[PDB]
């Protein structure tokens, strides 16, 4: 009977018959969590209450240090939430994310907290969490690096600059604490990410340039492939530098597009790469000039 | 575990929606208003009478005529009377014929015979790697050959190694030959064909070899597919003898299977998982390496391997957790993988005999002995003679 | 069969027992379909293993070949691995004298030993039979039980 | 656990009902395929449907003799196992209906629209047949003694037949091939053929097993006739341990078809036979059942025992495959070949496959030297297992 | 009678049937491990097949053939716990050893008895009607020189010296296991030598250390069988360290 | 295997493991039970003789329990024909031991001498294996009263309670169960001997025609071995009989 | 989500009127991108069957369904690569239709000789045996070149690489280019950004030590469905810690393993496919082969 004993206990609570407001508002749930982790997401998910998430919140926050260590406590909660979200209908889903955000706020490990702030994409929520990621240890160590890399990396932008919704608010705060101006901002901005891309490129190997033919309708295709394949640092550098060949021969809206696609390759460079984009801006027809701005945007996300 | 249970909540909603959604799309709301669409539905009703006869298309000629064998009466030289083109058709397929005038109305059914019905266990098992009682390394050999080229060609092309056309499993028996075949088959989520070797042996003249080649044809239409030839030795090199109509039969069904798998080269049309309980005392005429490349041999579990089979098992069970898994294995002597499974099952049943509900440390000890005894009586014991 | 609440359908270990549309060796699948439908059922797989001598010693053989497949479908198809509402009762006369197909693990998990008769047994069995058949004059059932036990029942 | 359990019971009932629906889901519509032009087609089809004179049945004349008071009748036999007589609805002539010729006849007039090519057996077998080979010695497992002995049969009489004719000898054309599977017996035969610059046709005896009893002999006879037609070619019979193989005169099995086929095959060969650089090879994949008639020397000139590639021949073929894929060069393959017993060319190629795969498991993209060791261990043991107790046979 | 049945037939295997087959028996019943030490070469057995109403004096699974050479065995065959086959081999090998002393003095060397025993099984392959003994003995001993030796014989009769070798309950398995435990430190220290033996035995532990019987033997000196009670002292402590590695 | 490579013992097994010995063990079970129990002033042997028939000449009282020596006796379970060569052999060995050692021969020494002949027959010389298990009962001054069990193969063990014959498995466990140690006496071991002999055997009556009982008892420091005569045997049976009778209906 | 995602009336109009988003919608992409590791495979399981339903339901339906189904693969990131890559390839040989190559190549960026093996062959064969126009040629080349870019370079995943339970990048931009003809010249400006990339970073960090090429981890890449997708998968499997970027979506499972080395993960696998985060008690983070 003993092996089964832990699961049946928590399996029974899932039902949550009659009273739904409990009598305790911490529930009997707490000792069972440490022993069995499988039963628990079944309970939160079927229950599909914000109240369910309240009971789970109080017990994980205390349990963090005391029961065993911080590291296992952190692990137990992340799994539980994951089953539960699918089962909850959308108006209520936002409420559970915030409730979870509080359990994490205290915790030494931030990862799951950032996901919850991302889902919402709220200005205020993301600010609160960020300041909290850095605060635990004033030394750079896990705390600052975890917060900075994890929140910033997250996507919401097709261009490689990731979020940047967080970026302006979070940065002023990080330089103020002072571990250096250059370190906080360098990680925070896309500059560090430009290097790590470069190094990975070699191992993976490259499909060659996106050039095919510079004559006929094929010149339009050539233009488009360069943009699609690489939104980062290429190895197709040699074709883009030489603007005159690819970019000009282009017809109709493809001219604008050729000029855009060139910015994708130049993205992760702006310490010399900027100058051509500006030549294109001054000169010629509207399609090319407008293309150069779109492209500038792309480069100035580096 | 948790994940497996969750998939079921989505699937419960899915059945309900799919049955309603089917209705609007299939027709009677997408009722043919299109010249192409209406023409096929209306024309086949008019040509068709009832009854009809099934046939299998023996060969086609490129002048819009073909030769078929109908189930009833003679064969017919039929024309392609409307509908399907030449390309669509292939020999070895089953096609539908009107009795009024035998002609190929079409196939889109991937055949239809009573034979195909037995072959298609098409809907996958829930059995999957590490739901098996198996050895970690042994399943991962079956996967490497059969499964992996389809899933990632990447590793095989860079490395520069040749993809096989099947594999072969052979005993010492009681090693989960069949369990392995079912585990891989679920993972591909490709149609799983199955036939037992004795069905292919018969005392009728010539029927057997049609079925053996037929397995590869049915599979090809469905393809990708994995074709499970259960107990290959049965058609092959294990006796039906020379005095029951085996004398002709075995040699033909065995030979027929052996030549296509071999071809003239390793064809690589459809993958095969072949299970045999031995090739140990049986005669040569079976598929050799370098057409099916890797041939997988099973051991007889040692102490170290027994850890991997046992840990999987102890989870469904209980109160062998209290006592260390390592010590339990050490104590027991060497036995085959079915035997190990049998001890564990028997532990659950013997508690019920004791007047207890389920496995205890004591029940687990006794079950080990009982199986061991069967084997020790059956075959040689300890110290020399 | 009475206790378990099953329909006793005795199943031959033969599969040349069909010639209805073809041999049983060929049509192993039909036996299965019927078995399922008339569930619960007990399929009594009677192969005494005192038929065959070289078949018993070896692994191969025609009888062995056909028998092996009928058993393998029981596992592959399941419904003796999802359920056991239908019990496969094998019968042999000894612990070990079995044919290779029947013997091996994974189509066995139990073997049961019953003694031959004794005076005490002979009393019980004789009594029950005596009443049905015709009871003797003044009762001497006890005498016959004491004197010697029955060879079989 | 508990909450889920009820969902399990309900879902099963759901799946049952759904299994019927897949039929409908695929289409309610009775149609297979159809485009706007088969509408035109259809008007014509209608008449053919209407009339019972069509469809046309396939029948085959077994022999020509009848022409009894009407333009030639013959006995044509439909596949419902009933004989019928033919009349004209095109023509009838000695040449329109022949000994082998199949015919198209009506269900309820039995008149000939068209004759069809003689026999079912030569059209189907044509797909199976491959033409001139392009394979070479390195691929068989290098230069083997068995290879050189094939040259003597194939290459010498074919290239220069004029020397054998002048001398007074007939040239040798026959070989009996025997040994275990995987040696590369067909592969070797093909190898010599390519250099010699002669056609090759595979014939598989098992692939045609169209029977109505004694029918099997007519197929043997046809496959032989076709080989003979192509001069400067080699015919290789695969899988002839049955239907054209061992008799059963001790039988109690209801066979006579293997015996019938054997009868015809020995007879055609024996005495003389009309050939002109058609090499006849026989491959026997069965040690258990052998046909003595064919097996002894004579018209089929030599017997060669087919043996696995020698030590130099296996090293050489491995080298060729090894370079193609990623391998470390200085390769330990030589140390392993010498250590181990005789290993075939098929076997060595599986080593390369298996070594690649171990290497992927380790998480390298180079298959290293360690990987080749595990791959040889696996292959040698698998080959080794088969027994059929040969001593028992030697005794009797 | 058949060709295969006969004792004469060198078989496609390329080696005589009865010699081959005796070699496939050296796993199962009983277990014998012997490791080499400077001051004691020690053999230990597990399973003397004793119900503990059966005399342990009668069954010798560790018998001293000389006064500086001893051997422990295991083997596979029909009918468990089989004293007989092993027992003839003890009787001829021990007398021969005593006869050797009489002919050419002092305690006889480890390597010589092992050479005699391997050849004893070999000569039988020529001799009429006779198959070789399926036994592998771990000949454990010290030479007259005092050079410690650990020797092992096989069923065909080829012998090799080793530093440490284990047989029975799967020979290959116990040999492999013993190689993780063996170290050059183990040979120098008197406590570790005993534990090395016990450490191979335990992966098929049965019934205490009272089941397990060890002997130490010294340079010219008789077999000293350590008490069934002493052995237990090592097992309780060691068994815990054992669980962790496998 | 799939065929034995035995049909002679001048040719050997297809596994090198001897089947014939397992058939020999089965042979003891075919034949009637032999049991030995230990006592604190003797040892006794109880065996079921081949003869059950009423007509017995009865010149012999020893027809399965043979007194070999002036210190030891043995019994047979198995074929009677085999004992006759063995019994005369055992007499030679038993007196051979005395000649050199002149000591109350130990049970372990006599058994090892015999095991040499049984192991050779199975290995070579073309002689068929034995089918008897013999129980040796004797006294030495260095451990006491002893009982040994010998097997057809040459396999031996010292016991102080052992039984073989009429399903060995059941019988040895049962003989042990009812045996007690250091609580015993010769009369009570003998009364008990019939009781256990009764249970393993199909008969619930048993007579001196069916059974033959021997004592080995040490008197004035020397061992006197006798196989008992029928009237004496009957008295041990009747002692048991009252109890057996109550079990019955 | 899933319930909405089958809802159809399409036998009135083929405009936007009653026609609606329905054929396009049938993929069930929005969730797969957003949330859960399990859900992504289950919905695709539904999806396979849906292809037939549109295809058989109308001839017109088949043409539109084939384009959007090819996008599910990129938007959703399924663990299935069986049916759909091959299906598209075979139909395009039969019927010239240029949209098919384009939608497929967007999938083919993800891991470029898993899926790309098939696609490259099909796209080349059609390209050089069929051309209808210069315009037609232009599409087929664009797809053919876009398709290869060896093994997971600037790979597409709709992860964050810290989790995939979060809100991914704007997927709707390739979805826009895929629904309508890519032959439309007006489209071109929007067309240039349809990227939906996820980092090629697998750098270990989350602590200051800043070593390149992270810890040992577990993966099974001989799979198309897997046992553990609870949240974090099995941490045994077959070991991987190589420098080359991870090959997901038929060897998706990564468990982060680090306990044996005595450092512990701050980031447990939450759907991540990029950078590891750990709290390192070591000055140099070990690197392994596997």
Curated annotation (Swiss-Prot), chain A:
Component of the 19S proteasome regulatory particle complex. The 26S proteasome consists of a 20S core particle (CP) and two 19S regulatory subunits (RP). The regulatory particle is made of a lid composed of 9 subunits, a base containing 6 ATPases and few additional components including PSMD2. Interacts with RPGRIP1L. Interacts with CRY1 in a KDM8-dependent manner. One of its GO terms (biological process) is regulation of protein catabolic process. Component of the 26S proteasome, a multiprotein complex involved in the ATP-dependent degradation of ubiquitinated proteins. This complex plays a key role in the maintenance of protein homeostasis by removing misfolded or damaged proteins, which could impair cellular functions, and by removing proteins whose functions are no longer required. Therefore, the proteasome participates in numerous cellular processes, including cell cycle progression, apoptosis, or DNA damage repair. Binds to the intracellular domain of tumor necrosis factor type 1 receptor. The binding domain of TRAP1 and TRAP2 resides outside the death domain of TNFR1. This is 26S proteasome non-ATPase regulatory subunit 2. The gene is Psmd2. It comes from Rattus norvegicus (Rat). The chain holds residues 153 to 454 of 908 of the full protein. The lineage of its organism: Eukaryota, Metazoa, Chordata, Craniata, Vertebrata. The modification Phosphoserine is found at residues 209, 211. Transmembrane segments: none annotated. Belongs to the proteasome subunit S2 family.
Curated annotation (Swiss-Prot), chain D:
GO terms for molecular function: ATP binding; ATP hydrolysis activity; general transcription initiation factor binding; proteasome-activating activity; TBP-class protein binding. InterPro entries: 26S_Proteasome_ATPase, AAA+_ATPase, AAA_lid_3, ATPase_AAA_core, ATPase_AAA_CS, NA-bd_OB-fold, P-loop_NTPase, PRS7-like_OB. The modification N6-acetyllysine is found at residues 79, 385. ATP binds at residues 179-186. Monoubiquitinated by RNF181. Phosphorylated. Dephosphorylated by UBLCP1 which impairs PSMC2 ATPase activity and disrupts 26S proteasome assembly. It is found in: Cytoplasm. Its main location: cytoplasm. Keywords: Acetylation, ATP-binding, Cytoplasm, Nucleotide-binding, Phosphoprotein, Proteasome, Ubl conjugation. Pfam families: AAA (PF00004), AAA_lid_3 (PF17862), PRS7_OB (PF21236). It comes from the Eukaryota. GO terms for biological process: proteasome-mediated ubiquitin-dependent protein catabolic process; ubiquitin-dependent protein catabolic process. SUPFAM superfamilies: P-loop containing nucleoside triphosphate hydrolases. One of its GO terms (cellular component) is proteasome complex. Belongs to the AAA ATPase family. Component of the 19S proteasome regulatory particle complex. The 26S proteasome consists of a 20S core particle (CP) and two 19S regulatory subunits (RP). The regulatory particle is made of a lid composed of 9 subunits, a base containing 6 ATPases including PSMC2 and few additional components. Interacts with NDC80 and SQSTM1. Interacts with PAAF1. Interacts with TRIM5. This is 26S proteasome regulatory subunit 7. It comes from Rattus norvegicus (Rat).
UniProtKB/Swiss-Prot annotation, chain E:
PROSITE patterns: PROTEASOME_ALPHA_1, PROTEASOME_ALPHA_2. InterPro entries: Ntn_hydrolases_N, Proteasome_alpha, Proteasome_alpha-type, Proteasome_asu_N, Proteasome_sua/b. It is found in: Cytoplasm; Nucleus. The keyword Cytoplasm applies. One of its GO terms (cellular component) is proteasome core complex. Glycans are attached at residue 136. The modification Phosphotyrosine is found at residue 159. Ubiquitous. The keyword Phosphoprotein applies. Belongs to the peptidase T1A family. The 26S proteasome consists of a 20S proteasome core and two 19S regulatory subunits. The 20S proteasome core is a barrel-shaped complex made of 28 subunits that are arranged in four stacked rings. The two outer rings are each formed by seven alpha subunits, and the two inner rings are formed by seven beta subunits. The proteolytic activity is exerted by three beta-subunits PSMB5, PSMB6 and PSMB7. PSMA7 interacts directly with the PSMG1-PSMG2 heterodimer which promotes 20S proteasome assembly. Interacts with HIF1A. Interacts with RAB7A. Interacts with PRKN. Interacts with ABL1 and ABL2. This is Proteasome subunit alpha type-7. It comes from Rattus norvegicus.
From Swiss-Prot, chain F:
CDD domains: proteasome_alpha_type_4. GO terms for cellular component: cytoplasm; cytosol; nucleoplasm; nucleus; P-body; proteasome complex; proteasome core complex; proteasome core complex, alpha-subunit complex. The keyword Phosphoprotein applies. The modification N6-acetyllysine is found at residues 127, 176. PROSITE patterns: PROTEASOME_ALPHA_1, PROTEASOME_ALPHA_2. It comes from the Eukaryota. Keywords: Acetylation, Cytoplasm, Nucleus, Phosphoprotein, Proteasome. This is Proteasome subunit alpha type-4. It comes from Rattus norvegicus. The lineage of its organism: Eukaryota, Metazoa, Chordata, Craniata, Vertebrata.
């Amino acid at each position: 009977s003993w092996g089964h004993e832990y699961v049946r206990h928590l399996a029974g609570e899932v039902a949550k018959e009659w009273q739904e407001l409990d009598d305790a508002e911490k529930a009997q749930r707490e000792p069972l969590l440490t022993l069995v982790k499988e039963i628990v997401p079944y309970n939160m998910a079927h229950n599909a209450e914000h109240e369910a998430c309240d009971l789970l919140m109080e017990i994980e926050q205390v349990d963090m240090l005391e029961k065993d260590i911080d590291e296992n406590a952190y692990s137990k909660v992340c799994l539980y939430l994951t089953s539960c979200v699918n089962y909850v209908p959308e108006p209520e889903n936002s409420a559970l994310l915030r409730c979870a955000l509080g359990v994490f706020r205290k915790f030494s490990r931030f990862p799951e907290a950032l996901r919850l702030a991302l889902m919402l994409n709220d200005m205020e929520l993301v600010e609160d969490i960020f300041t909290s990621c850095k605060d635990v240890v004033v030394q750079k160590q896990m705390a600052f690096m975890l917060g900075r890399h994890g929140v910033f990396l997250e996507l919401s932008e097709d261009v490689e600059e990731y979020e940047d919704l967080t970026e302006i608010m979070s940065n002023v705060q990080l330089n103020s604490n002072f571990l250096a101006l250059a370190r906080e901002l360098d990680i925070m901005e896309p500059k560090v990410p430009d290097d790590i891309y470069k190094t990975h490129l070699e191992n993976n190997r490259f499909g060659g340039s996106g050039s095919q033919v510079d004559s006929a309708r094929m010149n339009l295709a050539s233009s488009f492939v360069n943009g699609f394949v690489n939104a980062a640092f290429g190895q197709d550098k040699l074709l883009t530098d030489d603007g005159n060949k690819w970019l000009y021969k282009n017809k109709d809206h493809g001219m604008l597009s050729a000029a855009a696609s060139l910015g994708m390759i130049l993205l992760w460079d702006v310490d010399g790469g900027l100058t051509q984009i500006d030549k294109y801006l001054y000169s010629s027809e509207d399609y090319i000039k407008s293309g150069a701005l779109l492209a500038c945007g792309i480069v100035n996300s580096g | 575990t948790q994940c497996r249970l969750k998939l079921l909540k989505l699937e419960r909603i899915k059945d309900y929606l799919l049955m309603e959604e089917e209705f609007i799309r299939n027709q009677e709301q997408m009722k043919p208003l299109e010249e192409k669409q209406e023409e096929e539905r209306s024309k086949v009703d008019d040509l068709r009478g009832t009854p009809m006869s099934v046939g299998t298309l023996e060969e086609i000629i490129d002048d819009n005529h073909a030769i078929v064998s109908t189930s009833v009466g003679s064969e017919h030289y039929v024309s392609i009377l409307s509908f399907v083109d030449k390309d669509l058709l292939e020999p070895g397929c089953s096609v539908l014929l009107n009795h009024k005038v035998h002609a190929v109305i079409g196939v889109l059914m991937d055949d239809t015979d009573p034979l195909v019905t037995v072959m298609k266990v098409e809907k996958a098992p829930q059995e999957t790697y590490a739901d098996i009682g198996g050895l970690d390394n042994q399943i991962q050999e079956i996967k490497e050959s059969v499964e992996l080229p389809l899933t990632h060609p990447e590793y095989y092309e860079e490395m520069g190694i040749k993809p096989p056309k099947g594999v072969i499993l052979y005993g010492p028996p009681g090693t989960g030959k069949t369990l392995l075949a079912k585990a891989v088959a679920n993972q591909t989520s490709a149609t799983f064909l199955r036939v037992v070797g004795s069905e292919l042996i018969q005392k009728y003249l010539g029927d057997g070899p049609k079925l053996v080649r037929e397995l590869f044809r049915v599979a090809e239409e469905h393809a990708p597919s994995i074709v499970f030839i259960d107990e290959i030795d049965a058609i092959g090199t294990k006796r039906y003898d020379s005095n029951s109509g085996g004398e002709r039969e075995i040699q033909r069904t065995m030979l027929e299977l052996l030549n296509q798998l071999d071809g003239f080269d390793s064809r690589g049309d459809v993958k095969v998982i072949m299970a045999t309980n031995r090739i140990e005392t049986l005669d040569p005429a079976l598929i050799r390496p370098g057409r099916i490349d890797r041939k997988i041999e099973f051991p007889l579990p040692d102490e170290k391997t027994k850890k991997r089979i046992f840990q999987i098992h102890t989870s469904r069970m209980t109160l062998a957790d209290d006592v260390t898994l390592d010590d339990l294995i050490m104590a027991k002597d060497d036995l085959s993988g079915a035997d190990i499974k049998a001890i564990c099952t028997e532990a659950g049943l013997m508690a019920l005999r004791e007047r207890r509900m389920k496995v205890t440390n004591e029940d687990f000890k006794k079950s080990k002995e009982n199986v061991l005894y069967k084997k020790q009586e059956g075959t040689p014991e300890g110290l020399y003679l | 069969a009475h206790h378990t609440d099953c329909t006793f359908i005795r199943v031959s270990g033969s599969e040349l027992v069909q010639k209805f549309i073809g041999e049983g060796a060929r049509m192993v699948r039909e036996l299965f379909v019927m078995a399922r439908e008339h569930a619960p059922s007990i399929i009594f797989m009677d192969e005494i293993d005192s038929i065959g001598s070289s078949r018993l010693e070896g692994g191969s053989g025609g009888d062995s070949e056909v028998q092996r497949t009928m058993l393998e479908l029981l596992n592959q198809l399941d419904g003796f691995e999802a359920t056991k509402n239908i019990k496969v009762i094998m019968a042999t006369n000894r612990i070990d004298i079995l044919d290779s197909a029947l013997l091996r693990p994974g189509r066995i998990d139990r073997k049961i030993e019953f003694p031959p008769p004794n005076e005490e047994a002979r009393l019980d069995i004789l009594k029950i039979h005596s009443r049905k058949m015709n009871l003797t004059r003044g009762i001497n059932l006890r005498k016959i039980a004491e004197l010697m036990p029955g060879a079989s029942g | 656990q508990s909450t889920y359990s009820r969902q399990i019971k309900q879902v099963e009932d759901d799946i049952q009902q759904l299994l019927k629906k897949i039929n409908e889901l695929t289409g309610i519509k009775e149609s297979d395929t159809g485009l706007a032009p088969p509408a035109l087609w259809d008007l014509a089809a209608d008449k053919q449907t209407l009339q019972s004179e069509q469809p046309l049945q396939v029948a085959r004349c077994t022999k020509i003799i009848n022409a009894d008071s009407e333009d030639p009748k013959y006995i044509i036999n439909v596949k419902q196992f009933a004989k019928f007589v033919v009349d004209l609805s095109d023509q009838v002539a000695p040449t329109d209906i022949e000994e082998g010729m199949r015919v198209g006849v009506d269900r309820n007039k039995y008149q000939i629209h068209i004759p069809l090519p003689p026999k079912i057996d030569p059209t189907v077998t044509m797909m199976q047949v491959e033409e001139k080979p392009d394979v070479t010695y390195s691929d068989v497992g290098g230069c083997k003694e068995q290879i050189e002995k094939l040259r003597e049969v194939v290459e010498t009489p074919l290239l220069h037949p004029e020397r054998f004719v002048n001398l007074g000898i007939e040239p040798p054309k026959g070989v009996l091939l025997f040994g275990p599977p995987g040696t590369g017996k067909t592969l070797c035969a093909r190898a010599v053929a390519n250099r010699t610059d002669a056609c090759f046709i595979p014939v598989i005896g098992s692939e045609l097993v169209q029977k109505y009893v004694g029918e099997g002999a007519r197929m043997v006879r046809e496959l032989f006739e076709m080989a003979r037609t192509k001069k400067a070619c080699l015919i290789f019979f695969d899988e002839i341990d049955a239907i054209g193989g061992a008799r059963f005169d001790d039988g109690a099995g209801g066979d006579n078809e293997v015996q019938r086929t054997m009868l015809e095959l020995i007879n055609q060969l024996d005495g003389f036979d009309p050939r002109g650089n058609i090499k006849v090879l026989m491959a026997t994949n069965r040690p258990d059942t052998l046909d003595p008639a064919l097996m002894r020397p004579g018209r089929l000139d030599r017997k060669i025992e087919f043996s696995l590639p020698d030590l130099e021949g296996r090293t050489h073929i491995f080298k060729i495959h090894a370079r193609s894929m990623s391998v470390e060069r200085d390769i330990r393959f030589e140390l392993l070949a010498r250590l181990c017993p005789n290993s075939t060319g098929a076997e060595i190629r599986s080593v390369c496959t298996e070594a690649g795969m171990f290497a992927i498991r380790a998480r390298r993209k180079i298959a290293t030297e360690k990987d080749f060791l595990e791959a040889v261990n696996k292959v040698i043991k698998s080959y080794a297992k088969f027994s059929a107790t040969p001593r028992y046979m030697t005794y009797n | 009678m058949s060709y295969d049945r006969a004792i004469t037939v060198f078989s496609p295997d390329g080696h005589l049937f009865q010699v081959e087959y005796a070699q496939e028996a050296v796993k199962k019943g009983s277990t014998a491990v012997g490791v080499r030490g400077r001051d004691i070469v020690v053999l230990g057995v597990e399973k003397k097949s004793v119900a503990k109403l059966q005399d342990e004096r009668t069954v010798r699974k560790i018998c001293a053939l000389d006064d500086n050479v001893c051997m422990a065995f295991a083997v596979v065959a029909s009918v468990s716990g089989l004293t007989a086959d092993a027992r003839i081999v003890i009787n001829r090998a021990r007398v021969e050893c005593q006869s050797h002393r009489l002919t050419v003095g002092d305690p006889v060397t480890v390597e010589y008895i092992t050479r005699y025993i391997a050849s004893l099984k070999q000569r039988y392959t020529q001799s009429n009607g006779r198959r070789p003994f399926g036994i592998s003995a771990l000949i454990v001993g010290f030479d007259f020189d005092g050079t410690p030796r650990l020797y092992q014989t096989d069923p065909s009769g080829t012998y090799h010296a080793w530093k440490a070798n284990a047989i029975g309950r799967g020979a290959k398995s116990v040999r492999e296991f013993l190689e993780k435990n063996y170290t050059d430190d183990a040979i120098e220290t008197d406590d570790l030598t005993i534990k090395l033996v016990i450490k191979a035995l335990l992966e098929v532990v049965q019934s205490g250390g009272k089941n397990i019987e060890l002997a130490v033997m010294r340079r010219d000196q008789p077999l000293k069988i350590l008490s069934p009670e002493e052995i237990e002292k090592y097992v309780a402590e060691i068994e815990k360290e054992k669980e962790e590695n496998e | 295997m799939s065929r034995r490579y035995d049909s002679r013992t001048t040719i050997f097994s297809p596994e090198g493991r001897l089947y014939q010995v397992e058939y020999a063990m089965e042979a003891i079970g075919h034949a009637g039970t032999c049991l030995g129990i230990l006592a604190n002033d003797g040892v006794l042997l109880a065996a079921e003789r081949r003869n059950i028939h009423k007509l017995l000449d009865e010149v012999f009282f020893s027809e399965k329990i043979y007194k070999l020596n002036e210190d030891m006796a043995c019994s047979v379970a198995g074929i009677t024909s085999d004992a006759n060569v063995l019994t005369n052999e055992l007499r030679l060995i038993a007196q051979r031991y005395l000649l050199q050692y002149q000591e109350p021969i130990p049970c372990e020494q006599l058994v090892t001498a015999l095991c040499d002949i049984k192991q050779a027959y199975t290995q070579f010389g073309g002689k068929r294996p034995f089918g008897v298990s013999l129980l040796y009962i004797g006294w030495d001054k260095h451990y006491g009263f002893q009982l040994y069990q010998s097997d057809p193969s040459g396999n031996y063990g010292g016991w102080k309670a052992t039984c073989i014959g009429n399903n060995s498995a059941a019988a040895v466990s049962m003989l042990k169960q009812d045996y007690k140690e250091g609580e015993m006496t010769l009369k009570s071991a003998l009364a008990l001997a019939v009781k256990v002999l009764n249970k393993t055997m199909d008969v619930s009556k048993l007579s001196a025609e069916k059974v033959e009982i021997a004592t080995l008892t040490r008197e004035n420091g020397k061992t006197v071995i006798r196989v008992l005569k029928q009237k004496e045997v009957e008295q041990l049976i009747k002692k048991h009989e009252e109890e057996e009778a109550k079990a019955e209906r | 989500l899933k319930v909405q995602q089958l809802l159809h009336i399409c036998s009135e109009h083929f405009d936007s009127k009653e026609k609606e988003e329905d054929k396009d919608k049938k993929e069930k992409k929005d969730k797969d991108k957003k949330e859960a590791p399990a859900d992504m495979g289950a919905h695709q399981g539904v999806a396979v069957l849906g292809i037939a339903l549109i295809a058989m339901g109308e001839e017109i339906g088949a043409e539109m369904a084939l384009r959007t189904f090819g996008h599910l693969l990129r938007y959703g990131e399924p663990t299935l690569r069986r049916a759909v890559p091959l299906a598209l390839a075979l139909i395009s040989v039969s019927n010239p239709r240029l949209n098919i190559l384009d939608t497929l190549s967007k999938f083919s960026h993800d891991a470029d000789p898993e899926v790309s093996y098939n696609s490259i062959f099909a796209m080349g064969m059609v390209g050089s045996g069929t051309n209808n126009a210069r315009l037609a040629a232009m599409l087929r080349q664009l797809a053919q070149y876009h398709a290869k870019d060896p093994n997971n370079l600037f790979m597409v995943r709709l992860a964050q690489g810290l989790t995939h339970l979060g809100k991914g990048t704007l997927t709707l931009c390739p979805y826009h280019s895929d629904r309508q003809l890519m032959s439309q010249v007006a489209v071109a400006g929007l067309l240039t950004v349809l990227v939906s990339f996820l980092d090629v970073r697998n750098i270990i960090l989350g602590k200051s030590h800043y070593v390149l090429y992270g810890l040992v981890a577990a993966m099974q890449p001989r799979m198309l469905v897997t046992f553990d997708e609870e949240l974090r998968p099995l941490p045994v499997s077959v070991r991987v810690g190589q420098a080359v970027d991870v090959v997901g979506q038929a060897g998706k499972p990564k468990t982060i393993t680090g306990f044996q080395t005595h450092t512990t993960p701050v980031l447990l696998a939450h759907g991540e496919r990029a950078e590891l985060a750990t709290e390192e008690f070591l000055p140099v983070t070990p690197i392994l082969e596997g």
